[PDB]
Structures are given as structure tokens and as C-alpha cells.
Write a protein that holds these residues in place. Structure first.
Motif, mmCIF file in Angstrom:
data_model
loop_
_atom_site.group_PDB
_atom_site.id
_atom_site.type_symbol
_atom_site.label_atom_id
_atom_site.label_comp_id
_atom_site.label_asym_id
_atom_site.label_seq_id
_atom_site.Cartn_x
_atom_site.Cartn_y
_atom_site.Cartn_z
ATOM 1 N N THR A 192 36.102 -0.924 -16.865
ATOM 2 C CA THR A 192 34.814 -0.380 -16.418
ATOM 3 C C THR A 192 33.630 -1.312 -16.694
ATOM 4 O O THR A 192 32.610 -1.235 -16.003
ATOM 5 C CB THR A 192 34.551 1.015 -17.014
ATOM 6 O OG1 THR A 192 34.744 0.967 -18.432
ATOM 7 C CG2 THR A 192 35.500 2.044 -16.403
ATOM 8 N N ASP A 193 33.762 -2.175 -17.698
ATOM 9 C CA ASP A 193 32.771 -3.226 -17.984
ATOM 10 C C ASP A 193 33.362 -4.574 -17.571
ATOM 11 O O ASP A 193 34.157 -5.158 -18.303
ATOM 12 C CB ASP A 193 32.399 -3.234 -19.473
ATOM 13 C CG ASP A 193 31.480 -4.401 -19.859
ATOM 14 O OD1 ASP A 193 30.879 -5.044 -18.970
ATOM 15 O OD2 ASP A 193 31.360 -4.671 -21.069
ATOM 16 N N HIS B 262 43.933 3.621 -21.099
ATOM 17 C CA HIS B 262 44.105 2.562 -22.094
ATOM 18 C C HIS B 262 44.962 1.408 -21.590
ATOM 19 O O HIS B 262 45.314 0.526 -22.373
ATOM 20 C CB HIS B 262 44.690 3.121 -23.407
ATOM 21 C CG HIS B 262 45.993 3.834 -23.225
ATOM 22 N ND1 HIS B 262 47.178 3.167 -22.993
ATOM 23 C CD2 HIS B 262 46.296 5.157 -23.220
ATOM 24 C CE1 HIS B 262 48.155 4.047 -22.855
ATOM 25 N NE2 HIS B 262 47.647 5.260 -22.991
ATOM 26 N N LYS C 49 35.675 -5.098 -20.795
ATOM 27 C CA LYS C 49 35.732 -4.090 -21.851
ATOM 28 C C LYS C 49 35.572 -2.698 -21.249
ATOM 29 O O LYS C 49 35.582 -2.532 -20.031
ATOM 30 C CB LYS C 49 34.626 -4.316 -22.887
ATOM 31 C CG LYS C 49 34.644 -5.658 -23.616
ATOM 32 C CD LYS C 49 35.743 -5.743 -24.658
ATOM 33 C CE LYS C 49 35.611 -7.024 -25.468
ATOM 34 N NZ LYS C 49 36.585 -7.056 -26.592
ATOM 35 N N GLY C 50 35.397 -1.701 -22.110
ATOM 36 C CA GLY C 50 35.210 -0.329 -21.637
ATOM 37 C C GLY C 50 36.534 0.398 -21.653
ATOM 38 O O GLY C 50 37.228 0.410 -22.673
ATOM 39 N N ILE C 51 36.875 1.024 -20.532
ATOM 40 C CA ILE C 51 38.192 1.624 -20.370
ATOM 41 C C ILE C 51 38.903 1.078 -19.141
ATOM 42 O O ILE C 51 38.290 0.462 -18.263
ATOM 43 C CB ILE C 51 38.158 3.177 -20.313
ATOM 44 C CG1 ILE C 51 37.221 3.679 -19.199
ATOM 45 C CG2 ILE C 51 37.808 3.753 -21.679
ATOM 46 C CD1 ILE C 51 37.389 5.161 -18.878
ATOM 47 N N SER C 52 40.212 1.298 -19.103
ATOM 48 C CA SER C 52 41.021 0.999 -17.934
ATOM 49 C C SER C 52 40.663 2.029 -16.874
ATOM 50 O O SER C 52 40.858 3.225 -17.084
ATOM 51 C CB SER C 52 42.503 1.087 -18.321
ATOM 52 O OG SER C 52 43.363 0.799 -17.225
ATOM 53 N N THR C 53 40.095 1.573 -15.756
ATOM 54 C CA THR C 53 39.586 2.508 -14.734
ATOM 55 C C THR C 53 40.709 3.455 -14.299
ATOM 56 O O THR C 53 41.798 3.003 -13.923
ATOM 57 C CB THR C 53 39.037 1.766 -13.497
ATOM 58 O OG1 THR C 53 37.964 0.908 -13.894
ATOM 59 C CG2 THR C 53 38.522 2.772 -12.442
ATOM 60 N N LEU D 249 42.405 -1.023 -25.460
ATOM 61 C CA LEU D 249 43.047 -1.346 -24.183
ATOM 62 C C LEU D 249 44.245 -2.280 -24.303
ATOM 63 O O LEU D 249 44.320 -3.120 -25.205
ATOM 64 C CB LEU D 249 42.027 -1.953 -23.215
ATOM 65 C CG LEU D 249 40.743 -1.164 -22.940
ATOM 66 C CD1 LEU D 249 39.953 -1.879 -21.856
ATOM 67 C CD2 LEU D 249 41.023 0.281 -22.543
ATOM 68 N N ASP E 244 30.939 -1.251 -24.693
ATOM 69 C CA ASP E 244 31.245 -0.039 -23.943
ATOM 70 C C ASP E 244 32.452 0.719 -24.510
ATOM 71 O O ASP E 244 33.262 1.247 -23.758
ATOM 72 C CB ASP E 244 31.510 -0.370 -22.459
ATOM 73 C CG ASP E 244 30.237 -0.555 -21.643
ATOM 74 O OD1 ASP E 244 29.142 -0.739 -22.214
ATOM 75 O OD2 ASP E 244 30.341 -0.529 -20.400
#
Lengths: 278, 279, 278, 278, 283
Positions: free
Chosen positions: B108-109, B102, B114-118, C49, C257
Motif C-alpha cells: 500500500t506504500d 501479510h 511498506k504498509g500492507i500487502s494490498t 510482510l 505505514d
């Protein structure tokens, strides 16, 4: 001495010997200069590709070869022979692959940022301990490959004739012995399972182009060399043969994705005992 | 000193000692301030790349180094006794922390940000050792031309007083050292020396790549036996016990030019020792 | 009783108890309504996030927490204590991940076709059985993370002070006990190997973003809980503590996503015997 | 037969029985015609996706179900019962996945070239042998999934009520027995670890979308069915229950990436012995 | 047949060895390296179906089982004797040879840098299949296919239709007990059709593994120190009927991919067997 009798006891009846074999990935140890080619020592030179389906001429310094050493054991001579009982062996230096700060192809090629791509791809680990040279069986990807005649030992070196189509499978004519360091290409010459009665060998292969390299190392692991009858390799003329190859993958440059093989050295500590023979 | 006799029995003949070794990924423990650099503790600073094939000078705070500790054992000494390390329970702690997806890492996007924190991914390296003297080290580098700093770190040139040579890219037996300081010996240079370490046991593994999933197991039920093939554990010279380790989990990657930071985790050791009669 | 004596024999000297612990991924069991949030039970809510390097404020319902239960054992009282001998444990429901017919981000994003992408990514499986609460050691990714003060137990909850940089490595001050279900985030709290003398725990972690989830299940596997001296966890005040977390990865929605953690329930069947103590 | 006594000796006291269970991936065995749907036997029909977060209506022929068979044992009747001692079991036909010459989505989609992409993705292998039907525990991805009322046995079939949010975790109300072949979806129904005292089951799951399928097969492996007390499943009314599912992944078509599940048949050879019971 | 004591005395134990070359699709002849011989050890280019109803693979694109029958020394002068002797296979050392050859990444395969036509020649990758068997009679085979509609050639491969004299049925995509054969010929039974039959093979031991995918790294181990035990749960190895010993295998490493339309060729490697046999009394 073909008949194996009792173990010998008394002063100096057991010995331990150690050695390291450096990798033979293509660049020779000399010149030592870090500008004139020595900077590639431990690596191959840049892999050069075939120019057509009928024109595949790899340079010698792009072909990893077997490492080997013959070690002379204490003088002996019912006769006695040195018997190899066990070996502790280790591939040293995997931590060096954590260098991702160099000038390899970077992980962000758009902006030339990220990290220097670490060594990845095809891996090959073989070691052998025996009382005579490792017996080799030839088998190639392409019988049409035009290996150099000088500077490498290939199937044609042995047969004095061009490779045949059977050399892409098992051709019992194409055999050799691993009798020279840095000369026998590993893409040609494999341990011969039909011979090697007096050698133990252990090999693994993992292929691919970007495969993560994997390695374990410890000083606590002993490889037993005794056969099903409790007899280890017997050292002919008091010679002990060590053979290996340890390929970790390739590094890739920033220019036309040139690949260089990476090899690592292997340590051996062999325990031997004297054996009565007749 | 050298000849190993019977086990000592009686009151206080066995002891257990415990320690944790924090990782040494590049940022030192101080400054503690979470705005002055302390926020990177447990991590390296951002990995800096070579500017040419002949200009590779990594900053020390980007290079993970060995962790080590020397622990003092209870005082000893007709004939002499030494402490013998019999077994160790060891554990790498905190893999659950890598489930934080987080944060503000490269997402990841990357189309929509957006997405998640790699999460942390990539090359991993785990080694531990327990011995009765410092871990013996063998030098071997990717590139003998690398211009390691001459201050604040121990490299091959520190030992030899000469520049590296091409043999340092393979096995050069001149290039050896002892792990005698915490946070000083880079792991990309210094490896356990299998030609020495008669009085240490070490265990290591390496998994490479750039996006490789990190893997770790942890349990308080696993004992590592330290006895050799003769039933003898490391013998502690001058009642000193040496613990050494490195535990790299991979890198995190930032949202600014893909800067990578190494992540390390702490390692717990619980060592069981017994007194041994020696001659 | 610190000194462990003989095993107790006779009627009702061995008992067997079973329990299931449901996952605590972020959405609470209530509201039950499948339109009011209950449809997320077994999952987290959408992971939110950080907005900058200094502003990371995760919502409580996005953080998986430890599951735990305290089971009361038969009354007992040289005294006697219940000793946990072994456990059969199983994670149930992996077959449910074969549902690839829902409305997740599809496998063909170009055309919005294919299948509904199954749960993938980071996985975390830990269980523990003990005679007292699991001892926890805090360690975080970022000591600057702004966890909610209410609704989760975090390092600041214990210390009454903000996290310090040492909390990103091992800080012995940052310790707690797993004394409440669904409250201790797994990204903060780890089994403490410096304590837990009276608990056995077993954990594994596999990271990454698209990693295939892997799970095995059988009713034939017994986990022995006896230590090296043949003594299992001893149940203080006849209380038995079960702790776990079983994260399978994330599902990903069709909107920006958004990721949701997936957890599965764990079964425990514990065999216990009475032990004489003093 | 609650109390287990000695093994029965003498003529015909041990027997072996064998069976194969074909997969139930969605297309039934009939129609047999290779132009009327029979060409999909061994596979599911094309997986149909939800149309929104609240509209998930999978067709029955897209849902793999448990395979099962009840085998009749020799008549028996201090009484005697058949006890299953061990099983040799094998999944047959993995070599058929080496057909990469068909009309699946090709490996080069830019030019529509290469090979026909082989079966890949999520895999699920479970088998069970018992003296009564396998006990099942329901658990779903989504309690809102609108399964058909006819032609499949789902949680609502059992409870006579819509699924609840607890059905996404462990809800002990949602239980059934595997009493019919090709009817119980594997994405709903899991072996129940809280029951199955008289059955042994063994399961594994590997997820993902393009994961390489892996399978081993040999006629040299025996699975022991005896419990910790040396007692195997006892066959009630001389009935032996075999249950399994063996999903290898999906093939993907050249039209909108439609996925079809692939299953393979499983062989069982069970050794049974007569046991005295009271 | 009732299995009795082990036979003792001179020549009561023997070791025999053999190698089986792979049968990936190109036959061993013509030997010429310009007339097709250059593909030996490989398949010819895999040809694809043209529709859902038109799948006609060429024979030389289909890997087939390797097999050899070895004839052992005759043991019994008179088969009417109450007690006889048979050769019993106790153990085998087996090895797949030549994985090192896959380290040739300097050829003319599809290159890894497709922008510049540089990098390396992509190595063999993808689906892998390793099976070996040792028995006292032919390996029993069970047919099972991906697609019962596949139009295999009638001449040049032994397929289900060869056996049944009828077209495949939908049941042939699962387990159809009618579709059985014996591995009685080298280089003829396609491995995508014919599988070891677990319902038979009482006098054979087989060991197989499959790893799928398209770009999967090939993995192989090799050593001369590993013995495979062939004794069953009763201590009895395969018994050689009429002194015949059957060896069967397939060892697929993946595919190479050419620079022309991503054409794939299967790669196989040869397998070595060294079998230890002993004489066994039987009645």
C-alpha cells in the motif's frame, strides 16, 4: 373499449410472448464488418466534445438512443383486448465486462501494464411495457446543443423550432412518442409521467465518471404490470410496445481518453390475458 | 414426463444432497506442486493484455470459467416419478482468507515498499444455478475480434464452427450452448440464457471497477426456494441434478508490473428434493 | 436425544444468560502495563510482510483469531435439554473510532497536519450460537504461508502435514472445531457449512484498504435461532457455545505505514427453554 | 412498579410531549458573540493532535459529548406509571450542509478555487428514549489518552483511577449513567447492552475521512418503543429521558487542514400512556 | 376540527396534477440563450467567501424551495353549517424528471483528461438534496444555517433576518425556535437556510434526503408505478384549508464544473405530482 369488464376464459385466453431488444448506443447494426465499423456494435463511437460554450455539435453515432419494438398479438375481433399482466425482464451479458485483457487504457499507464480498464462510470436502466408507444417528455442539459437535423429525433424535429431555455427544465410543449427504434436520444427524451396511462415504466440512473457498474440477473423475478385497480396495459389494435435502454458506462481508449458508451441487450417475457371491454 | 401431478409420500420420498464446487479461475487443480504452478490453484494466472486493437488473444489459464457438477440421484421407476428440487442452502466459503494482508502483493506504500500487502479488490461476479438439466447459456462478448484459443476451452466459434460476428457483441440467438463441462466455458463469454432455462433457477450479480471493495455475506440460516409460480421445482431428467456457479472476488496485484490474478472461492450447495408423480 | 419432543413447562423452564466476548486481534490481555505491550490490547501488533514470494512468516500477534466461550447451563437430568431460542447481540464501542486526535498517520501527509486518520479498511463480522463447538473449514490465501507451529492452531496442527494446494480452495480434510479462545486465525478458519447442524452462524465481509467502517447497534433487535422445524440449537451436556470475530479495519502509524488491526467486543444475551428429548 | 398490569383508560390517559436537543460538539452555547467563540456553536473547536505516542491531550472543546434532557411528566399518584409507547424523531438541518460558498479548504487546492469543501467524513447517529438515565459502558481507543479532569466526565471520573488496558476492550468496571448534558464524550461512552432494560436505543456509525454524509428526514416515521411483551419504557418518578448525538462529519479550514466536528439538532415527539402497576 | 366519514357520490374523488420547475438561482427570464436564459435549470457560478468574516453569496447562486398552491373546487356554500366538507389528500405519485439529461458528457465542462483537454465533459456530481411535501397549508419552515455570520442579501431572498428584523444569532447554527417561517412563495426561501419544521407541519407530509460530498455519483429512480400514501396513523390525509393544496420541493442533482477556475453551477430537475383527493366530512 374504455370500460374494463371481466377476464375472458377458454382455449387460448392467455398467451406468453418473448423478445430481446438490442442496445442502440450509436454504432448501427450495419455495416457488419469488424473492420469497417461493425466492431463498435453494442457501443457508441468516440464521444466528441464541444469546442466552446456556444458550439456543442454531438455526432449521432455518439448518442445512445431508446430501443423499442412493437409486437403484434394474436387476432381478437362487447369486444376483447389483450391485457399485459406481468413481465420477466433481464439485462444479459454483464459477465462480458470481466474482459480486462483488451487494449483499453491500462491501469498502469506509466509502464503500459496492469489490466485493460473495465467499463465504468454513468449507468442508466429503463424499461417499459405498454399498449401504445411510450410517451416522452423532452428535457436537455443545454438548449443550445446543435443536434443533427437528420438521423435523430430531437425537440426541434417535433416543434419545427429551435429549443428554448424552458427545455432545460420541464416544458410541456416538448413531447413525443417513442415510435421508432434507435432514433430518440436518451439525453433528450424521458418517460412522461403526465401521460403513459397505458404503459408501466421503471427507471434508474447512477452517474459519475469511474463508478463501478452494478447489475443483478435472475430468471425468478416477475414484474407485475397491473395498476391499483388490477388492470394491466391494454393493447390497442393488438400491438404490444416494449421500450428500454441499458447503459453500463464507458470504455476508455489509450488515445486522448476517448470514451465509448457500452449498452447491453434486454430480454422480455410478457404474460398476457384476454379482457372483455366496452 | 411433462404433466405434473401430486407429491409422492412414504419412506424415502424426500432426500437431501450436498456438494461443494471449487472455483475455476484458470490454473487447473494439477500439478499439485507448490513450486510448479499448484501455488496458483484458486487463482488465475497473470492476466495478459492485447498488443493492439486487432490482436487480443487471452491465454486459457487467465480466463475464469463456470464451475459445474452433475449429481446422480436415487434410482426411480403404473406411472412415473421424478425428483423435484424444492430448495437449496448455498454459501460461498472462505472470505475470511482475504484478511491475509501479510503476503508479497503490491504494497500500500509504494514509496518505501511498506504498509500492507494490498488485499483482493475489484470486479466481482457471483452466480449460482440449480436445475434438472444443464444450464442453458447465451454467448455475448466484449469484442467479437478476440482470438480465443481453439483448444482447451469452449467458445462461440466452438459451437458455430465459424468466426464471431458483430452481433456477438450484443444478443445473437445463434450463439448458444449448454453448461455441460466444468472449467471449460469462460464467464466473459457465456451467460445464463433467459430465453431457455425453464427447468433451472439461476441467480446472479455483478459489481465492476478496479479497486472496488469485495463484499460477501454467509450464514447457514438462509434457504433459497426453487419452486416456480406454480409451486413446481426443477424436475431432474434421468435422475440428474445440475449445479452451476462462479464466484469471483476480484484480483490480487503483484509487485512486478502490476500483474493481476483473479481470485475465486468455493461454493457449498445443500439441495432438498422430493419425489413427484408425473405423466 | 436425537428425537425432539414437546417444550417443558413449569418453574425455571426458561432461562436467560448473558456474556461478552472480548476481541482477539493479536496482543494478549497481559502484560497489562501500558508501556510493556498492554497498550495494544484490542489491537494487533504491527503487521509484518512477506520478504519474497516464498517467504511469508506472519507473527502470531499480527493474526486476528476467533473469540469463543463455553457457558455452563443449569443442571437438568425421556430426558430434557436446553434449547437456544433467540439471541440479542451487539458490537460495542464503535463511538471510540471517533477519536481522531491521536498519533496515527495524519490526513495531510505533506505537512503532517489535519486529523489522526481513523480506523479504515477491511471489516469482518461473524457470530455464532450453538450447542457444541463451531465446526470450522480451513481455507487460506497461500498454502505456502509459514505459520508458527506454537501459539496458533492452523491446518498443519490438525493434519500433522504441510498445507497442500487444495487448501487454497475447499479441501474437506482441513477441518477443526472452535474449541479454544484466541487460537484459531480468522484468515484460515471459516464456518463449515457442511456441518454445524446444531449451531447458527451469521457472517459478513467487506474488503479494501481505506473502506469506511460501518456498524449499527441497538438493544431492540432479536435474532431467532429456531430452524425451519421450530427447533433451536440443543445444548449437549448443558454447554452453550458462543463464537465471534469483529474486525473494524486498521489504524496506520506515522512510521512506514505500519498497520494494526482493530477489533471490538461483542455482547450476547441468549434466551433458552427446556425441551423434552428421546 | 415491578409488575405490569392493564392500560389505564379515561380522561388524560394518553399524552404527547415534544422536545429538541441541540448538539454538543465542543463549543458551548455561550459566549453568544460571533467574534468571541459563539461562531463555533454547533461545531467543535479545532481538533488538536497528540504530540507523540505517549502524549495525547485532547482539549474538552474538541470532543463531542452526549446530548440529554430529562422531561417532567404529569403527576400521577395499585399505582400508575407513564409508559412511552412510541417516538417520532428527526435530525434537522442537513440542508445547511449545502452551503459550499464559505471559506473552508477549497476543492481545487492547486489554484485555490472551486467550492468551499462541504462537511464530510465520520458520522455517528444515536438516540435513546427511556424511563431512567441511559446506562453507559466506557471503551476507548487509547487508555493512555490524557483527558482533562475538569469539564468532562471520563472513566477516571468514575473509578478515581487511571484507565487500564482493559478499557480498550470491554471492562465491566467502567460504567456510568448519562445524567448530564454536554459532559460525556461519545468517543468514551457507549450505550451499555448489559443494562438499559428500561430504555430503547438505536445507533449507527459510518467512518472514514472524506465519506459523503447521508441523512433522511420525514415526519411520517414512527419508532415503536414497546418490547417483545408489549411494554414500553416506564417512567420512574414521572421522568422521561431523551439522549442523542448526531455528528455529520467535519469541515476543514484553509490553515493546516484544521478539522471542526459538525453536529445537528434532534427533534423528539413521544407518545405516552398511563399503565397500572403493582 | 373533528374528522368524520368519507363523502360518497358523483365527483367525491378527484386527481390533480402539477409540475414544479427547479429554482437553482437563474430565474426563468430573460429567456434569451445569450443573456442568461442558458443558465435556467442551474445556478450561476458559486462565489466564495473572501475571508472567515466576509461571506456574501449572490442570490442567483443559492437554490431555493419550489412551491405551488393549487385551488380545489369549493365545497361549502355556508361555513356556518354544523357539518362541512374538506378535500383530503390521500396519496401522491411523484417523479423527478430528466435524469437521462445528465448523460450529456459531450459539452464544454471541465474535461476528464486535463493534460490534453480531452476525455469527456465531466458530468454533474456531488451533493444532492431531494425533498417533497404535500399539505393543506404552507410548509412550516425552521431556519438553521452553517454560519450565522453569512451576509445574505437583504433583497431578493427570504432569510432569517427577513423574518426577525435582526441579524442572525449563534443559536441559528443549531435549533433556534424563534427562526421560523412558512413556505409561501416560490423561488425565494434558500434551502441552505430553511428546513421542514418537525415541531409543526401537522397538516403536511414531507419526505427528504441528503447525500453530500464533492464528486459523489448522483443516483435517482423513477417509475409511474409508485404511490406515496399521505394518510397519517389514524387514516387521515392532509385537509385542504380553504380548498388550498400546497406542493413544495427541491431536487438538487449536484454541480457541473466549468473550465474556468473550477466554477461550480448547481443543477436541479423538475418534479411531477399527481395527487388523489377525496371529500371528507368534518365538524
Amino acid at each position: 373499449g374504455m370500460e374494463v369488464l371481466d377476464l375472458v376464459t377458454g382455449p387460448d385466453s392467455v398467451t406468453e410472448i418473448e423478445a430481446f431488444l438490442n442496445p442502440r448506443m450509436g454504432q448501427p447494426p450495419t455495416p457488419e464488418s469488424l473492420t469497417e465499423g461493425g466492431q463498435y456494435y453494442g457501443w457508441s463511437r468516440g464521444i466528441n466534445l464541444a469546442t466552446s460554450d456556444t458550439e456543442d455539435s454531438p455526432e449521432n453515432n455518439t448518442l445512445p438512443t431508446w430501443s423499442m419494438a412493437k409486437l403484434q398479438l394474436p387476432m381478437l375481433n362487447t369486444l376483447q383486448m389483450w391485457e399485459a399482466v406481468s413481465v420477466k425482464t433481464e439485462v444479459v451479458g454483464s459477465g462480458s465486462l470481466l474482459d480486462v485483457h483488451g487494449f483499453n487504457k491500462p491501469t498502469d499507464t506509466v509502464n503500459t501494464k496492469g489490466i485493460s480498464t473495465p467499463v465504468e462510470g454513468s449507468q442508466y436502466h429503463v424499461f417499459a411495457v405498454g399498449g401504445e408507444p411510450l410517451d416522452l417528455q423532452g428535457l436537455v442539459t443545454d438548449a443550445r446543443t446543435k443536434y443533427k437535423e437528420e438521423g435523430v429525433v430531437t425537440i426541434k424535429t417535433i416543434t419545427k423550432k429551435d429549443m428554448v431555455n424552458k427545455d432545460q427544465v420541464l416544458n410541456p410543449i416538448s413531447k413525443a412518442k417513442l415510435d421508432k427504434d434507435g432514433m430518440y436520444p436518451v439525453e433528450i427524451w424521458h418517460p412522461d409521467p403526465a401521460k403513459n396511462e397505458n404503459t408501466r415504466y421503471f427507471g434508474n440512473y447512477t452517474g459519475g465518471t469511474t463508478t463501478p457498474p452494478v447489475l443483478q440477473f435472475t430468471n425468478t423475478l416477475t414484474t407485475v404490470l397491473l395498476d391499483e385497480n388490477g388492470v394491466g396495459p391494454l393493447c390497442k389494435g393488438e400491438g404490444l410496445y416494449l421500450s428500454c435502454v441499458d447503459i453500463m458506462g464507458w470504455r476508455v481508449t489509450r488515445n486522448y481518453d476517448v470514451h465509448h458508451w457500452r449498452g447491453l441487450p434486454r430480454y422480455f417475457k410478457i404474460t398476457l390475458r384476454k379482457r372483455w371491454v366496452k
